[PDB]
Amino acid sequence: KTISVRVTTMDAELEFAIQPNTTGKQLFDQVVKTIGLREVWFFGLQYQDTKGFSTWLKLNKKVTAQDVRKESPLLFKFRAKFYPEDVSEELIQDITQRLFFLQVKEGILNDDIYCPPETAVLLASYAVQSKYGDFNKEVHKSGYLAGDKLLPQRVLEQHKLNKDQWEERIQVWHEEHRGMLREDAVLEYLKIAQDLEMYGVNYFSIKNKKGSELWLGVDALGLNIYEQNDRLTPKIGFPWSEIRNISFNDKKFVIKPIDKKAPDFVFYAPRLRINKRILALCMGNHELYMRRRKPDTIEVQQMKAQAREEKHQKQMERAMLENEKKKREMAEKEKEKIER
Amino acid sequence: QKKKLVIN
């Protein structure tokens, strides 16, 4: 009596045939096991509920009991729910970097995450290096990037350059990355992107006591209040260290400071659902904040090592390959000179 | 409905 489910990661598609009593947890486990992700703490299963709200699957309940939009298969998006503080320090596996890279690039390209042009071109140069490998004047002739969406729409139509003049600027940078591993360009992409003001921020529309409209931001470090007009710079910052507790009562959402003699900050949200979603994200972000500031578990040390073994194997498999190619590129230089 | 998250 199996229900069919489709799970789409940022670059792969999975079908499972679950039982009707299968938990989110059990499905999640089959997913990360299928693609060899062990850094599971960052990720979740996203879906559309019966009213078209995009919703995180709850791992401790039956999949079928969570108001999933009815169709065969059920459709989930495997996505990053949480972002590390430093991609260099905390993204261990190749799979993990790639899914983060792809999810963040989508956000940059569709203008969800704001990016100045120069930085946009620079990020575009690292994506090109990952997709096309070392630039090559033979293979990469003019307009070899013509069929590629490399910049955000906002960059394209507020600057006078044409798409070829953008492509040319991205090419200069692509030449400088010659010798960069595909995977090492992914990380450089992430090292630039993780510094942007809007990277790793979940915003919700809120109103203050008075009633002035605002945004709330929740990220790995805490909560922020932004003006309606400006989601780049916080008005005030609420880092975990400076917060006693965080509470909702229906539409009312409250931040109580550490300083018992300091007054509480109070906000209202359009619905209870928004307030549940906000508190869950704070809980999840705070949980990983605290874990980040504790020695690697034994498990994590083994992932760090398993990761190191596998990259070495790949490094050698790329040298063994490159060695046989230079035998063949020569074996033609020999037969080309015997002719001439 | 109410809920409290202790941060500190």
Q: How far apart are CA A330 and CA A317, in angstroms?
A: 20
Q: Which of A218, A223, A247 to mutate to test the interface with B (most CBs of B within 10 A)?
A: A247
Residues 6+ positions from A288 with CB-CB distance below 8 Å: A41, A82, A84, A220
Method for structure elucidation:
X-ray
Write out chain A residues lying below 8 Å of B2, CB-based.
247-249
Could you tell me which chain B residue has the CA closest to the CA of A240? B7
Q: Do B5 and A258 touch (CB under 8 A)?
A: no
Write out chain A residues lying below 8 Å of B1, CB-based.
248-250, 272
Q: Which two tokens stand for residue A170?
A: 């991205």
Closest listed residue to residue A249, CA positions, set A224, A264, A262, A267: A267
Residue A64: exposed, middle, or buried by beta-carbon count in 10 A (0-12, 13-18, 19+)? middle
Q: Do B4 and A241 touch (CB under 8 A)?
A: no
Q: Is A134 in a helix, a strand, or coil? A: coil
Q: Å resolution of this model?
A: 2.2
Rounded to the nearest angstrom, the minimum Cα separation between B7 and chain A is 5
Residue A146: exposed, middle, or buried by beta-carbon count in 10 A (0-12, 13-18, 19+)? exposed
- With b for 16 or more beta-carbon neighbours within 10 A and e for fewer, the A75-91 pattern comes to ebbbbbbbbbeebeebb
Q: Do A250 and B1 touch (CB under 8 A)?
A: yes
Rounded to the nearest angstrom, the minimum Cα separation between B6 and chain A is 5
Q: Is A39 in a helix, a strand, or coil? A: coil
Q: Which of A248, A250, A251, A259 to mutate to test the interface with B (most CBs of B within 10 A)?
A: A248
- Residue in this structure with the two tokens 């037969």, named with its chain if needed: A335
Cross-strand bridge partners of residue A79: A44
Q: CB of A213 within 8 A of CB of A229?
A: no
